[PDB]
Write an enzyme that holds these catalytic residues in place. Structure first.
Site, PDB file in Angstrom:
ATOM      1  N   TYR A  18       0.852  -1.191   0.000  1.00 54.67           N
ATOM      2  CA  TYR A  18       0.000   0.000   0.000  1.00 54.67           C
ATOM      3  C   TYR A  18       0.884   1.236   0.000  1.00 54.67           C
ATOM      4  O   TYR A  18       1.721   1.377   0.893  1.00 54.67           O
ATOM      5  CB  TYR A  18      -0.879   0.104   1.257  1.00 54.67           C
ATOM      6  CG  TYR A  18      -1.850  -1.000   1.613  1.00 54.67           C
ATOM      7  CD1 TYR A  18      -1.406  -2.248   2.027  1.00 54.67           C
ATOM      8  CD2 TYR A  18      -3.221  -0.759   1.617  1.00 54.67           C
ATOM      9  CE1 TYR A  18      -2.301  -3.245   2.382  1.00 54.67           C
ATOM     10  CE2 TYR A  18      -4.128  -1.756   1.984  1.00 54.67           C
ATOM     11  CZ  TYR A  18      -3.655  -2.993   2.365  1.00 54.67           C
ATOM     12  OH  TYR A  18      -4.531  -3.989   2.733  1.00 54.67           O
ATOM     13  N   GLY A  72      -9.408   1.035   4.624  1.00 55.10           N
ATOM     14  CA  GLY A  72      -9.759  -0.374   4.764  1.00 55.10           C
ATOM     15  C   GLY A  72      -9.732  -0.802   6.218  1.00 55.10           C
ATOM     16  O   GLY A  72     -10.494  -0.298   7.060  1.00 55.10           O
ATOM     17  N   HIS A  89       6.245  -4.846  11.858  1.00 52.53           N
ATOM     18  CA  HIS A  89       5.122  -5.399  12.621  1.00 52.53           C
ATOM     19  C   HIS A  89       5.097  -6.913  12.456  1.00 52.53           C
ATOM     20  O   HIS A  89       4.729  -7.421  11.391  1.00 52.53           O
ATOM     21  CB  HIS A  89       3.804  -4.770  12.164  1.00 52.53           C
ATOM     22  CG  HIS A  89       2.642  -5.057  13.067  1.00 52.53           C
ATOM     23  ND1 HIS A  89       1.365  -4.586  12.813  1.00 52.53           N
ATOM     24  CD2 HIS A  89       2.563  -5.743  14.234  1.00 52.53           C
ATOM     25  CE1 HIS A  89       0.554  -4.979  13.778  1.00 52.53           C
ATOM     26  NE2 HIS A  89       1.253  -5.685  14.652  1.00 52.53           N
ATOM     27  N   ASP A 130      -0.192   4.419   0.900  1.00 51.19           N
ATOM     28  CA  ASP A 130      -1.437   5.043   1.339  1.00 51.19           C
ATOM     29  C   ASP A 130      -1.507   6.490   0.876  1.00 51.19           C
ATOM     30  O   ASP A 130      -2.565   6.957   0.445  1.00 51.19           O
ATOM     31  CB  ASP A 130      -1.588   4.950   2.858  1.00 51.19           C
ATOM     32  CG  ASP A 130      -1.927   3.539   3.315  1.00 51.19           C
ATOM     33  OD1 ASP A 130      -2.942   2.996   2.847  1.00 51.19           O
ATOM     34  OD2 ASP A 130      -1.162   2.971   4.115  1.00 51.19           O
ATOM     35  N   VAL A 190      -4.391   9.992   1.598  1.00 50.60           N
ATOM     36  CA  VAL A 190      -4.833   9.754   2.975  1.00 50.60           C
ATOM     37  C   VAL A 190      -5.785  10.838   3.441  1.00 50.60           C
ATOM     38  O   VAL A 190      -6.626  10.591   4.311  1.00 50.60           O
ATOM     39  CB  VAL A 190      -3.658   9.632   3.964  1.00 50.60           C
ATOM     40  CG1 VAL A 190      -2.769   8.474   3.609  1.00 50.60           C
ATOM     41  CG2 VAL A 190      -2.865  10.933   4.057  1.00 50.60           C
ATOM     42  N   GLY A 191      -5.660  12.058   2.912  1.00 49.15           N
ATOM     43  CA  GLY A 191      -6.539  13.118   3.374  1.00 49.15           C
ATOM     44  C   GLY A 191      -7.982  12.880   2.992  1.00 49.15           C
ATOM     45  O   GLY A 191      -8.898  13.342   3.683  1.00 49.15           O
ATOM     46  N   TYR A 238      -9.660  10.223   3.207  1.00 50.36           N
ATOM     47  CA  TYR A 238     -10.301   9.287   4.124  1.00 50.36           C
ATOM     48  C   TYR A 238     -10.184   9.738   5.578  1.00 50.36           C
ATOM     49  O   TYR A 238     -10.403   8.938   6.499  1.00 50.36           O
ATOM     50  CB  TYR A 238      -9.720   7.889   3.911  1.00 50.36           C
ATOM     51  CG  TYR A 238      -9.948   7.430   2.481  1.00 50.36           C
ATOM     52  CD1 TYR A 238     -11.231   7.148   2.031  1.00 50.36           C
ATOM     53  CD2 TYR A 238      -8.903   7.362   1.569  1.00 50.36           C
ATOM     54  CE1 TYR A 238     -11.470   6.770   0.718  1.00 50.36           C
ATOM     55  CE2 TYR A 238      -9.136   6.981   0.242  1.00 50.36           C
ATOM     56  CZ  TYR A 238     -10.423   6.679  -0.165  1.00 50.36           C
ATOM     57  OH  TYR A 238     -10.689   6.315  -1.470  1.00 50.36           O
ATOM     58  N   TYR A 247      -7.029  -0.574   8.242  1.00 51.18           N
ATOM     59  CA  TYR A 247      -6.081   0.185   9.040  1.00 51.18           C
ATOM     60  C   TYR A 247      -6.546   1.602   9.316  1.00 51.18           C
ATOM     61  O   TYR A 247      -7.230   2.268   8.556  1.00 51.18           O
ATOM     62  CB  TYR A 247      -4.677   0.322   8.410  1.00 51.18           C
ATOM     63  CG  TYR A 247      -3.783  -0.747   8.921  1.00 51.18           C
ATOM     64  CD1 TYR A 247      -3.377  -1.815   8.111  1.00 51.18           C
ATOM     65  CD2 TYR A 247      -3.337  -0.695  10.239  1.00 51.18           C
ATOM     66  CE1 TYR A 247      -2.540  -2.837   8.604  1.00 51.18           C
ATOM     67  CE2 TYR A 247      -2.495  -1.689  10.760  1.00 51.18           C
ATOM     68  CZ  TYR A 247      -2.105  -2.766   9.922  1.00 51.18           C
ATOM     69  OH  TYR A 247      -1.273  -3.763  10.397  1.00 51.18           O
ATOM     70  N   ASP A 248      -6.168   2.078  10.509  1.00 51.56           N
ATOM     71  CA  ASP A 248      -6.475   3.455  10.937  1.00 51.56           C
ATOM     72  C   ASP A 248      -5.195   4.085  11.455  1.00 51.56           C
ATOM     73  O   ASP A 248      -4.512   3.496  12.292  1.00 51.56           O
ATOM     74  CB  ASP A 248      -7.540   3.511  12.038  1.00 51.56           C
ATOM     75  CG  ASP A 248      -8.804   2.771  11.672  1.00 51.56           C
ATOM     76  OD1 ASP A 248      -8.732   1.543  11.516  1.00 51.56           O
ATOM     77  OD2 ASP A 248      -9.870   3.410  11.557  1.00 51.56           O
ATOM     78  N   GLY A 301       0.419   8.046  -1.748  1.00 52.46           N
ATOM     79  CA  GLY A 301       0.517   8.256  -3.183  1.00 52.46           C
ATOM     80  C   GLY A 301      -0.561   7.564  -3.989  1.00 52.46           C
ATOM     81  O   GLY A 301      -0.986   8.091  -5.021  1.00 52.46           O
TER      82      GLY A 301
HETATM   83 CU   LIG Z   1       0.858  -3.410  11.217  1.00 54.79          CU
END
Ligand SMILES: [Cu+2]
Ligand SMILES: [Cu+2]
Ligand code: NA
Ligand code: NA
EC number: 1.4.3.21
Lengths: 620, 620
Positions: free
Chosen positions: A288, A372, A584, A290, A296-297, A299, A374-375, A292
């Site tokens: 992702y 989706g 992660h 996010d 992100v703005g 959402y 993720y936040d 490009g």
């Molecule tokens: Cu993660």
């Protein structure tokens, strides 16, 4: 009247009217990106010229366009046709996400795969994800999304608990064709639910938490003027918002006595990439961008008082364009407030008998986005003592898979049969520096260990060394936590009272950078993420570390192409790009909804002031 | 009734009487350390026996003693005479501090050095500093302090602004002899004052800060029972206080449903060392062991409500012994409160329509100490999600010197003629682990990069590896930030519902360790500081990483000698010792009083729970 004011609903409507009048926004056109351009370099320049940059998609398959408009003058400044197979596809449209699940529900290959698993198509949600660039020659020049399937047992069910592994589909969202359906075999669909509001899972709610009341009886200490100009405890800045980057800080300056001293001209998170580390063909394409690819703005959440932002909150409600050029307000999308931050300075002196304590505080500017599962929360902090800090907060629901029988080296087990693939979340901060003005340089500072011997007879001495980065070809740098490596941005023409150049020191968290093989598609597309620090000479068109058009774009744009110019950066108008991220390996405690984890960076004054800048803070 | 309760005034008074009647506390005797002993290992220890350990100094020159007394029974359990040339000198007494300045004031060599500099002896303050062990064979077995001089222009003046460089003296504080006065040359005494309460320096105080009011209208969420037992949001622990270590946490456990699950048996900062990196013979011996040599608990501050601790504060007032055995209360020496900590978890789900936000909180246990010019805050945090964190806050006034003409590789310039030598502040956390019980082991976890090839055709995979530390000889570890290195403490006999061992992960800040040459005196005496992580097998008498008697000990005591036993640590009762610190190159902004800087570490659950432990937190 400020050139840095937020875009207004009227400005966006006027851009729509100008594009329509010019013949550029007929019924087959869609706005994939719209944003205000910053003023060019030049004190004053045009008395007022608000210009907007627009990416225009065509749903009939014609070539898209990049257009610049002057809303002040009512004119199209430039309009260029884009060859997307060369320079990249436009960002994904919100309306294209819905197309994927609908198209797959009538495809006989998809239906056959679901029938083999005894799944009802009406209960199968499809996560529509960006495609990247891999081995499929038919995708070049086409807008592709890839879909992964999850079962939703009932309308309020968390589909993330029920991944359908072994299955992926690729969809052309313009021609509305399913290009490929790949089925590598049936995996059991994990059956446990992940409904974190179900009392069966939560148990009885705690009754032990007593309220914490944070109030400001006389109101906050900051002022907001002109819609988005902030003054707080000697800081001055403008809070911008862009649909791609989200919150952008402009004109960060500090009032030192009678002088407003610039520090940072523009600060933003200019890209963020989330690469997945599972080699299964079902997910090995998964990356992702996010910022490009998705913007992100776009959402950003509406933030609720008392839940998301606690205290005396001042809100901004930025306006963005929808796909047709109509303005859309993100109500309460940005929270601003000040926070107590513990002790600032303290000393009890035996000899003088003076006991002295002062308290710290910080100003917080934040927004949250949801993409989706993720936040992500984006937090900028200004402190009394001149420190500037950024913090990203990652939460939401982890992306899931089946957990294979016999285990995995690339997937964590969260629940019976339920896996979570390893991945990273990597950010790029673009810091257009202006330490006391635009003549700046970067020095790398390492600790220096010294050998016991002449002039160091007790073996206790240690030192440091600073290396000036003089040209872009030598300004691609790696972290070294063992030697305490930091970077100093200084102004060689502005000295403090000790005749030393004023500066700020960048402190990194020294987390791992991109782990993928250097020959991989993701390493070429996200080259910025392979190194901790880049310095470029400022240029108007060098905005993002990945270039303008990231979606389905191969390598060839962005930071590696900029630094090839090998420009002088020793006492020049420069831009620092800092890579930082989280690696992660999901744990059981991340399921079924993940507690916040954080990463960031900070900048501290380094001989910028002539003494502590907080001697005038009162005791209260 | 708890064996872990704080020592009371009455207990200390009983110890004094027991020592007195036993003939151990005559007029030549001084108590240099007094503290309660923890209960010995025993999951059935019922008969209460409160025992105290005492170090007794003799001002007439007789051998000191180590004494253990039972206050329950009124008896001396053991008394041993100490040979300090062998096992080290006793901690520095507060009453020995003033002796240094007074003795030097009548020494002809000292007076002649001051006369040459035209300094009035009545205005010269002497910092009495620990001696260490260097080349002076005449110091072995004697109690030595070294003194550095500062000028106080008037009684409320900050003497730290006026160091007298080129001058150092050594003093035998028992025989009351000045053994050496070293004058290496005249340096100008810096003339600018550093009085941070002088309006001439501060300027007019800010009027822009509006109040932040933090209240708990229903009281706090934690309970305190038995004087020092805390229950808060599933956590359970006892707050101890020792004159050497300061705040000590006992019996840290988490209530998981119906079971109280142990996590850490005892947590403390067991040593802290401040080595200086200036090779000048005036200062090249300078190394503070604030815990081991000075005892940080005895210099704890009384913390003022609304200034030091803000909010709904619960105070503890620990009792210690003075040098004659009288109890002394440190009023309001420990602050306890809970704090809001932002967002805990958040997700807005498109498919389910559920929007979910929860807020986080932390419990704070803190104290502040002052040792000469420096002031240190010690903060322990417990979070709702099971995270435990420690943070040290460093402030106060930096130690100063002259700034040489032609500059320096080892000293920063803060003001005209005023220097600040480079130094570090290095802490050792001693964590007696008890993850679900005492059968624990440590694994080192590194990220593993994978090469593009078969089974990884797209070059995206990455993984991790865990290495069990099985014996003490292999349990001395270094950080590696580049590979994301962490350490996991697990219980191999306690599994979560996925049949994996429960664990906690230690996240270090990966700051530089001790920089001194490996052959130096300080590297031998502070060997713990040369490596990031040590694991030992638990033993009753292995309390401090530097040994019991740190002052003027020649080296090797503590961790290097414990580790040499090479004991089994694979599924045993083990102790983790984590080194972490700040490397301080002083900046102009640190002067005349330093804004707080911080360092710490944290531990997070790693499959300790069967799912997120904060699903039962309400919306509020
Ligand atoms: Cu993660
Ligand atoms: Cu320091
Ligand atoms: Na710049
Ligand atoms: Na243990």
């Amino acid at each position: 009247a400020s050139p840095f004011r937020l875009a207004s609903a009227g400005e966006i409507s006027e851009v729509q009217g100008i594009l329509r009048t010019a013949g550029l926004l007929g019924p087959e056109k869609r706005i994939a990106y719209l944003g205000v351009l910053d003023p060019a370099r030049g004190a004053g320049s045009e008395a007022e010229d608000r210009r907007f940059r627009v990416f225009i998609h065509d749903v009939s398959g014609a070539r898209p366009q990049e257009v610049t408009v002057s809303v002040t003058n009512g004119t199209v400044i430039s309009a260029v046709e884009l060859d997307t197979a060369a320079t990249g596809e436009l960002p994904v449209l919100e309306e294209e996400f819905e197309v994927v699940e609908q198209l797959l529900a009538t495809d006989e290959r998809w239906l056959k795969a679901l029938a083999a698993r005894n799944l009802d198509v009406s209960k199968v949600r499809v996560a529509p994800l960006s495609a990247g660039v891999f081995e499929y020659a038919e995708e070049r020049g086409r807008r592709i999304l890839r879909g992964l399937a999850f079962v939703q047992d009932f309308p309020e069910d968390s589909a993330w608990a029920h991944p359908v592994d072994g299955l992926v589909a690729y969809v052309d969202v313009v021609s509305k064709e399913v290009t490929r359906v790949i089925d590598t075999g049936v995996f059991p669909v994990p059956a446990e639910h992940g409904n974190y509001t179900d009392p069966e899972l939560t148990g009885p709610l705690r009754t032990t938490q007593k309220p914490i009341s944070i109030t400001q009886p006389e109101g906050p200490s900051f002022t907001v003027t002109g819609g988005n100009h902030i003054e707080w405890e000697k800081w001055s800045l403008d809070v911008g918002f862009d649909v791609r980057e989200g919150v952008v800080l402009h004109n960060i300056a500090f009032r030192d006595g009678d002088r407003l001293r610039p520090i940072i001209n523009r600060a933003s998170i200019a890209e963020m990439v989330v690469p997945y580390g599972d080699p299964s063909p079902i997910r090995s394409w998964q990356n992702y961008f996010d910022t490009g690819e998705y913007l992100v703005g776009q959402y950003a959440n509406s933030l609720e008082l008392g839940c998301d932002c606690l205290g005396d909150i001042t809100y901004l409600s930025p306006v963005i364009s929808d796909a047709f050029g109509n303005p859309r307000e993100i109500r309460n999308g940005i929270c601003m407030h000040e926070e107590d931050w513990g002790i600032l300075a303290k000393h009890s002196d035996l000899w003088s008998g003076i006991n002295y304590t002062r308290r710290n505080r910080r100003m917080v500017i934040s927004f949250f986005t949801t993409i989706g599962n993720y936040d992500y929360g984006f937090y900028w902090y200004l402190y009394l003592d001149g420190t500037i800090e950024f913090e990203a907060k990652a939460t939401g629901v982890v992306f899931t898979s089946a957990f294979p029988e016999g285990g995995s080296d690339n997937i964590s087990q969260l629940a019976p049969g339920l896996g979570a693939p390893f991945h990273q979340h990597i950010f790029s901060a673009r810091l257009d520096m202006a330490i006391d003005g635009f003549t700046n340089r970067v020095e790398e500072e390492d600790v220096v260990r010294q050998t016991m011997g002449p002039g160091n007879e007790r073996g206790n001495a240690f030192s440091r060394k600073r290396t000036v980065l003089t040209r872009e070809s030598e300004a691609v740098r790696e972290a070294d936590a063992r030697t305490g490596r930091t970077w100093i941005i200084s102004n060689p023409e502005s000295k403090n009272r000790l005749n030393e150049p004023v500066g700020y020191k960048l402190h990194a968290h020294n987390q791992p950078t991109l782990l993928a093989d250097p020959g991989s598609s993701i390493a070429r597309r996200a080259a910025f993420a392979t190194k901790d620090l880049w310095v470029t000479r400022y240029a108007d068109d060098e905005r993002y570390p990945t270039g303008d058009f990231v979606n389905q774009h191969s390598g060839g744009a962005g930071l590696p192409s900029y630094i090839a110019q090998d420009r002088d950066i020793d006492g020049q108008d420069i831009v620092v790009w800092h890579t930082f991220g989280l690696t992660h390996f999901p744990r059981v405690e991340d399921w079924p909804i993940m507690p916040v984890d954080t990463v960031g960076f900070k900048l501290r004054p380094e001989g910028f002031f002539d003494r502590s800048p907080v001697l005038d803070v009162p005791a209260n």
